[PDB]
């Protein structure tokens, strides 16, 4: 008669797949509340001591850093923490990375040749790209992207960059509609996460659009980490710890990968063969702890009037 409540900030099918796999292994039923990362973190905070959430699962790490800093997350069992590299878990061991995703530049080669793509994320503030690219200012990974630019280039250059994006980029409500606009030639390129293209490639088969990886430790080659945590207020602490530990088992990782083209955080495990290998992403040397709560980036987005 035990039901775990999962607050799922990850994409809906991914949360459903891991809940199904967990129930199959253990017989424990999982009830899912799906929302946005920050929305669920805010809801947990306001629900206080009587929150029903047992586990929180997010697409990005700033919400988990926020909640860990606020004192709401339970410490994870040391055997769970040993399943990932230390940079992929919270500094106090109260949240853990589950998969990693990466920033990409999706483009339509009928509208722009690969040879003519911007060399760097930083080039998109230049007037020559006016009208030619989309971005998603309300996206959690875009927040992290702004945080990365601040860390790598400084606040002054990051503000000049984001001003250029406001002047010259086209705003999309989410990564899915931005990807669709590229696929349909409504915009030449867009800044999104990598897994959206693989979802399209499965639904549709033969795509117009292609992915460009900035590589070269460019700010635009940022890798971000989707993570999980047990809530201190959980009435099922053993089962909640079992759930997070199961997410990082080979079976849980495969369950999550069956719905999202992301990189496993379980050490020693490879991704789907269709993915560009993690070793070749050449991402900037930024961890979740470096981006933190992304407070400077939210302050900048608010300053510029984008989110
Ligand atoms: Ga997403």
Automatic annotation (TrEMBL):
Record flagged with keyword Metal-binding: yes
UniProt xrefs under Gene3D superfamilies: Periplasmic binding protein-like II
Residue span of region Disordered: 274-307
GO cellular component terms attached to this protein's record: outer membrane-bounded periplasmic space
Keyword Repressor recorded: no
UniProtKB keywords: Iron, Metal-binding, Signal
Domain of life: Bacteria
GO molecular function: metal ion binding
Binding residue positions for Fe cation: 11, 59, 195-196
Matching Pfam families: SBP_bac_8 (PF13416)
Assigned protein family: Belongs to the bacterial solute-binding protein 1 family.
This protein's name: Extracellular solute-binding protein
Record organism: Pseudomonas aeruginosa
Gene behind this protein: fbpA
